[PDB]
Structure formats: structure tokens, C-alpha cells
Design a protein around this ligand. Sequence first.
Ligand SMILES: Nc1nc2c(ncn2[C@@H]2O[C@H](COP(=O)(O)OP(=O)(O)O)[C@@H](O)[C@H]2O)c(=O)[nH]1
Ligand SMILES: Nc1nc2c(ncn2[C@@H]2O[C@H](COP(=O)(O)OP(=O)(O)O)[C@@H](O)[C@H]2O)c(=O)[nH]1
Ligand SMILES: O=P(O)(O)OC[C@H]1O[C@@H](n2cnc3c(SP(=O)(O)O)[nH+]cnc32)[C@H](O)[C@@H]1O
Ligand SMILES: O=P(O)(O)OC[C@H]1O[C@@H](n2cnc3c(SP(=O)(O)O)[nH+]cnc32)[C@H](O)[C@@H]1O
Ligand SMILES: O=CN(O)CC(=O)O
Ligand SMILES: O=CN(O)CC(=O)O
Ligand SMILES: [Mg+2]
Ligand SMILES: [Mg+2]
Lengths: 431, 431
Amino acid sequence: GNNVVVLGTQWGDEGKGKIVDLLTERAKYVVRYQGGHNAGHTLVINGEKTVLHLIPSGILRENVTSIIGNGVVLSPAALMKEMKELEDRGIPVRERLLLSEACPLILDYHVALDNAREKARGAKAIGTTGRGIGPAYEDKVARRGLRVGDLFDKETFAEKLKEVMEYHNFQLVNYYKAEAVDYQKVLDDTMAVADILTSMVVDVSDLLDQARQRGDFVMFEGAQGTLLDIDHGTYPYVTSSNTTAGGVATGSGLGPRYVDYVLGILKAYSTRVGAGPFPTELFDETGEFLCKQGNEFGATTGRRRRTGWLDTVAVRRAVQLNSLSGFCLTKLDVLDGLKEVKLCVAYRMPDGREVTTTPLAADDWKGVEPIYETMPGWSESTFGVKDRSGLPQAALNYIKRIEELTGVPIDIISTGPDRTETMILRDPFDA
Amino acid sequence: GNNVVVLGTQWGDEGKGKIVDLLTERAKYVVRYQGGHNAGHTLVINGEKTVLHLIPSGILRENVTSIIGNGVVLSPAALMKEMKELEDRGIPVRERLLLSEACPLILDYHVALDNAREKARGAKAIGTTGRGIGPAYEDKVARRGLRVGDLFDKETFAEKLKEVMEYHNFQLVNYYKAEAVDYQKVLDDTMAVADILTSMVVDVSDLLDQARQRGDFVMFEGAQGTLLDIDHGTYPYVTSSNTTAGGVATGSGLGPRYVDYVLGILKAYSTRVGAGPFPTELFDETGEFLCKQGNEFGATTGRRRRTGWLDTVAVRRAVQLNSLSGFCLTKLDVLDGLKEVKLCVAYRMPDGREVTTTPLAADDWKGVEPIYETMPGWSESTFGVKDRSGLPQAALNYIKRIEELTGVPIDIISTGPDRTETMILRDPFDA
Ligand SMILES: Nc1nc2c(ncn2[C@@H]2O[C@H](COP(=O)(O)OP(=O)(O)O)[C@@H](O)[C@H]2O)c(=O)[nH]1
Ligand SMILES: Nc1nc2c(ncn2[C@@H]2O[C@H](COP(=O)(O)OP(=O)(O)O)[C@@H](O)[C@H]2O)c(=O)[nH]1
Ligand SMILES: O=P(O)(O)OC[C@H]1O[C@@H](n2cnc3c(SP(=O)(O)O)[nH+]cnc32)[C@H](O)[C@@H]1O
Ligand SMILES: O=P(O)(O)OC[C@H]1O[C@@H](n2cnc3c(SP(=O)(O)O)[nH+]cnc32)[C@H](O)[C@@H]1O
Ligand SMILES: O=CN(O)CC(=O)O
Ligand SMILES: O=CN(O)CC(=O)O
Ligand SMILES: [Mg+2]
Ligand SMILES: [Mg+2]
């Protein structure tokens, strides 16, 4: 249908970037509805690599208008920084990127805070990405955060900032005994790029309304994944926003009833970056082989990712939360060369109970062990294959099983980082 | 259809309570997906009054299971308090109410904070309801908030609380120089009702999934209204949550694509409680007559409500944000006796521009004046009328106009506080 949503069904890094970019070929708009620059998507066109963080992954297409919705936490600094890098490479960012005046602003102190909280947590740290995503979402919700629209009347912006900065420094200094952030440098750096920002402002919410009434193919691009959902995720080891399909309406302004199809990006195995429950986590050679073979390092912090088997119990939670319509199975090629492959099909609770449902809150996952279901592998190569035909039978089978255990069709299978190393069985846009 | 959403298209107090209760007759479930006990709904059955705050307005029906979704901020105190009052009146609360372990907990210090922030704001206060709604949403988003699930392992709950309470007292004391909240009394009061709470726990998200797969009529009941939306509302004069239709999926766990119909509660005139932009606000006799005649006082704080004309510019923002399917026109009877009636149809911007769109952020509303469209009134009585037929022509006309200016059909018209003083033209459940 017209409005297609692409999100991460696991713990982010499933392959949203590539997939957004591959499917945008047909779309007018691309909307990031949540997160900030903690995200790190990764598009590879004809072997040329672009890793986007805060800018929508539809940015490399002149025929698509990239929008950053009000749900997103906007860092003026990082935006300018990514902007220039894309511009140096001939991608006229400023020309194809629009933004919301409702977007909260991430400023230096937000990072100051994040660093503090995390240190305070001492040994039980969330393992956040370092930006000030959390604190920015808090200030937002606390109704003291600064938003893009505030950048307009600059005299008052300066009153507001001095005020908020005064607040956060007291804590930083007196409480965390950390060094305060200077109000002047914050004000200056922000003001130096204000005009750039305010320039891209548009009423995204009303924009999506007409795009829709016309029939425009729009694509929502999600950051992070389901189990990182501030609400439904492995709290408190989560991100401070709704990464689940409901952040679409709340993070863009589009009426919820206008989501037509929801595509879940599903990685073929599991990876996690940050502290948190991970039932199917591996610490053996196959664990190493997965990270190694799938170049599993964060596209934003550099951190090695925790690898594990594909958890069907957890993904099935994704199906229901996101109202999935289909799955895009990614990184299949990474499994090539494995003798056999396993997918967690049920959870063994700490008290002997066998369940096919997931707990909800880090703690409530404290002793769960997974009940796999071993499948034979395939030594054949699936890399860049563009057709089921080239996929070996084991593969076809491992894939069919996933459909059975979830009741969700795998509409897209990806055989490589390259925009073109993919098979599209059913295009979300024409369904 | 099966899933029906009922929300406030204005600034809350449109009449959600009555309408939820009237339509639940046909439903298995009722889900509150956001807010806390700042809400104050008001059902009147056969002249008997019940004002609900945190408990779903489907509570007075034995055949409906009331659920409080993870989006809601749960005050153990207030819950118990409302519970007992309903129980004293023969409504077996505990028997028909289920809840989420993901619901954040509002504890004494959250109120301590709210009071502080507001005082800090000195003359530019938001005019919040006094609960600790805001601070609770912040702690949530900050990943330090306590949730219903934490109440299970009580030894650790006590570590967590001591920790969070230590944090908030330092600020209260050292910063706001306010008196700290005792960790012991908080721990005790909470622990005294823990078991009650944990008793109603259910996996709401998975619950809604099966309710849906079966075909159960579910109703989402919203608190506050659209222009109070943390994101899309008149920031910062808003509530700390998404009152717009996207909070349904994010606040229940139901897949966004499963919203079938969205019903907007629209009050016939406008009222606002709290500080904030109010284009069509009245300060004359008609303003008085509206408050007086419509008993316009908050069902939660007691505060007189600011009354004004029905703003079509603002409501049209509601239509698009919520993907409305219909409107329930409430309190028509309150206008009886007026010579003529006006509805704002366009906004006159401070710079001479005429627009039919709304600004987004308190400030960006700083000088807008409304462009009405006077309609003749009707001295006839519409009170408790249960049929268009009894509605005078002026009325029919004032109503038809609303449809024209919005392109949204008025499916329900309400002529009184009583469950039965209403006309249902098209029942959301069978559409
Ligand atoms: N081998 C392989 N690598 C892939 C595939 N899809 C994506 N990648 C790469 O795998 C990584 C996905 O990382 P990431 O960008 O963080 O995922 P995202 O955050 O969802 O966009 C990046 O290196 C991608 O270029 C695939 O199907 N096969
Ligand atoms: N006259 C009149 N009063 C109504 C009507 N509908 C609701 N009320 C009353 O108007 C008020 C609505 O207030 P409130 O409960 O705060 O609305 P809510 O928060 O949306 O549930 C309460 O007094 C209701 O009993 C109506 O159609 N006519
Ligand atoms: O507060 P933030 O910065 O969001 O970090 C909280 C936790 O969420 C994790 N985290 C945040 N964003 C991501 C992403 S974004 P994407 O590239 O999948 O869109 N991925 C993985 N971990 C993340 C971070 O790794 C840490 O575990
Ligand atoms: O932080 P909170 O407690 O939500 O208060 C913030 C502002 O929102 C306003 N406020 C909060 N909830 C409501 C409701 S709930 P309902 O009965 O319509 O569901 N109504 C009106 N004002 C509200 C409060 O009046 C103040 O203006
Ligand atoms: O792709 C982005 N992630 O891996 C975030 C991180 O590396 O922290
Ligand atoms: O119906 C509830 N509101 O009026 C909230 C309040 O009175 O503060
Ligand atoms: Mg990534
Ligand atoms: Mg009310």
C-alpha cells in the first residue's frame, strides 16, 4: 500500500538502512519517526559505503524528500556534521531534507548528563551510545526541553537555554560532581547553525496528511528495534523512545489508521549491542564466527556486537506489537558454511515452565534458557544471490520454518550489504 | 469495526467518560492507554454519578474487563483509593480490572517534584493537575522509574527505590530547597498494597493480540485531548504523554494497524483547564454562560474551566492527527438559549496572513486571532433529546456546518450527562 513502515524486530542493526534505501526507489517521502543519532544505518551502493545516523536513509535519492519527524531527538551539531560529509560527496542534503519544529534539541549538556547517569549506574550501566538521547527525551517529556521551533525567536531561546542549562549544571556539579557545560558555547554553536535548521522546517504532520490524500508512497524508517522499546522493551536496558510500530503515528503526526503495511527487518541470527537479556546469546566459536563473518560492530559506537541464534520467541513478540505484514530476512549469507542452524522456539522459565511468550523487563528474564530446534545448514554460498533458485534447500527450509513459527511471510530476503544483493518477493508498496 | 478508539479532539473534558461507558455495552474490553489520575471522566447513569480518574470508564459493566495499559502512569495510592470507593458502591473493581507490569509507578516524590517544577516556573506555570504525572513520565523515559513489575521481587524493589529516592531528594532539598520525601513511608505505603496490584497483572499486549484474533469488541479510552499531546500539543502547556491516537498502539501493545475506527469526542464549544493558547476563549457573558450552563469545572482539580467558541481550525488538526472516522458531538444542550453561535473557521496570523492551519508550540500562537462564522442559535430545548427530530433546525444546521468544515461525519450527538441522553446515528462498533 501507500504507507510502508520499516522497523527492527530485534535489538536494532537488523538492516533497516539498506532496506529503506532499496525500497525508496518508488517513494516520494521517507520519514524517521524516532531516535536520534544513536542509530547507525548502513547503505552500500555499488560498493560505496554511507553510514547514516540521524539523516533518513532515503537521502541518497534525488527523487525522495527525506523528513525527520517530531518524534526524533535532533542534535544540531551532529546534523551539521553529517550534512557536510554528505555534501562533500555530492549529495545535496539541504536540498532534499525537511524537518519538524517539534523535534527536541540535543545539546552538549544532554551528553553531559548521559555520561553522568551511566557512570552513576556504575556496574549496572545500560551501555548507551554516548549521545544524549535519554536526557533529551526526558527534558522533552518534562516540558523544559528546547525544540527546533524555539530556534526562531532567538532572544527568548537564550533565556530558555540559560534557564535549562542553569538547572542541569547544578546537578552535574553539586550532585554528580561533574564539570558543568558552558551556557555561552552552547548558545553560540547552536546559533551558528540555527538558520540552516529553521530553513528545513516544514509542518510534517500536515505534510503527511496531503501526501496521503494524494496517494504518495511514503516510507517510515525506524531506528533501533522492538526489544529496545522504552515501553515494551527489556526495561531498563532500552532506548528512551518507542521503537515499535506505534512511534510512527506519534512520531510523525500521521493518523495511526494510515499505516498500510509494516515490514519487519529480521537478521537471520541475533546481535545485541548494549547491556541486557539475550537468551540465545553465543560465547563459543559459532558466536565468534557470527560476529566475524557478519562484520558485527556497531555502526555508531564501534562496539563489538553480542551475537546469538535467531530467537523466535522474541521475534513473535515483534509480530504482534508491530502488526507485522511481512519480514525481510537479512544477512542469510552470513550463515553459509555452518553445519547446522538453530532457532529458539520456546523459553524454559526458571521454575520449570515451558513457554512461547517473552517476559517483559530485564529482571523478568533472569533465568530463562532457550529451547532450540536444530536445522541443517548448507556449505553452498548464498552471497549476493538474487533468487530463491540460487538458495540451497536447507536455506529454503530454514526460511520456511521461520514462516511457520511466526505465521508471517518473508517478503524480502537479503544476500548482501549492497542495495542490489537482494530478492524482493512481494514489494510492500504494491500490497 | 472490532477496535474502536475514543479520544478528546480538543483540550480534554469533551466527554470521553460518558461515551466510553455508553458504547462499552457491546464490548469485552476497555483499555486506558495513557495518562494517570489527572484525568477525570464523568459517567452519570440514571442520575447516579461516578467520576473516574485512573480506572477505565468501562468499570461499571460486569460484562467488560477494564485494562490499564502500559502507557498509563500508575499511582498505587490513587488506585487503592478509587478502588475502595467503587467497592463501597458495589462495583467489584478487583474483579473486573486488569493491569500491566510495564505501567510506571507514581509515588509521593513524583508529586513532590511536580510541585517544585511548577513553583520554579513561578509566573509561567503549566497549571498541572498536581499528581506527579510529568515526573513519572520523565523517570520512565530516563529508565530509572519504577514499574508495576518491579513490585514482584520486593527486596530489590527496596534497593531501587532507596536509590531513586536518594536522587530526587538531593534535588528537592539542595536545589529546590524543598523538604525531602521519606524513603520509609514510601516503601511501606507501596508495600501495603503491592499484592493487591500484582494480583491484577496480565500481559495486556498479548491479551489484545488474542482478543483481536478472536473478534472481540475492544474500546480504547483516551485521557486529555489532542492539543495537550506532549509532541503535537501547545508545548510546553501540555501533558507529558501522547494523547493523540498514536498512544493507542504505544500505550497498549496492540499493533497500530489494528485500530479500526477512531472516534473523536467534540464538545460543541471549547473549554480549557490549565495555562495555554486558546484562540476562541471567551471573557464576556457568553463565556460565563458557557461555564455556568455546562457546569464547567474540572472533574479532578476543581478549577473553573476557560470556555470559548468551537475552534474548527484546531479541531481539523485533530482530524488529521487522529485519523478520525467520526465525531461525537457533545453538550449540544449547553448552547440552548443562545441567539446565535460562532465557530472559528480560520486563523488571522500576527503578520496579516489568513490561515486554516494551527501553529505548533504555545509561543507560535502568540498573536493569532480567530475568524468566526456566526450561525443563528435556537431558544428551543435540546436537553436529553434522543433524536435529530427533536433537535431544532438551527441545531441541525450548526451541526451540518461542522461536518462541512471538517469533512468528518458526526456519528453521535449527546444531549446530556446521562448515559441515555444521547443519539447514536452510526455505532463505531458495527462499521
Ligand atoms: N552480509 C550482509 N551484510 C548486510 C546485509 N544487510 C545489511 N548488511 C550490512 O550489515 C550491517 C547492518 O548494520 P546496521 O546498519 O547497523 O543495520 P541497521 O541499523 O538496521 O541499518 C551493515 O554492515 C550493513 O551494510 C545482508 O543482507 N548481508
Ligand atoms: N450537559 C451535558 N453535560 C455533559 C454531556 N456529556 C458529558 N457531560 C458532562 O460534562 C462533563 C464532561 O466532563 P469530563 O468528565 O471531564 O469529560 P471527560 O474528561 O472527557 O470524560 C461531566 O460533567 C459530564 O457528566 C452532554 O452531552 N451534555
Ligand atoms: O540511550 P541510547 O543511546 O539509545 O542507548 C541505549 C541502549 O540502546 C542501544 N542502542 C541504541 N540505539 C541502538 C541502535 S540503532 P539501529 O542502528 O539499529 O537503528 N542499534 C543497537 N543498539 C542501539 C545502545 O546500544 C544501548 O544498548
Ligand atoms: O501534567 P498534567 O497533570 O497532565 O497537567 C498538565 C496540564 O494539562 C491539563 N490537564 C491534564 N489532564 C487534563 C485533563 S484529563 P480529561 O478529563 O479530559 O481526560 N483534562 C483537562 N486538563 C487536563 C492540566 O489541566 C494542565 O493544564
Ligand atoms: O547501528 C547502530 N548501532 O550499532 C548503535 C551502536 O553501535 O551503538
Ligand atoms: O476532567 C478532568 N480535568 O478537568 C482535569 C482537571 O480538572 O484538572
Ligand atoms: Mg545499525
Ligand atoms: Mg474530564
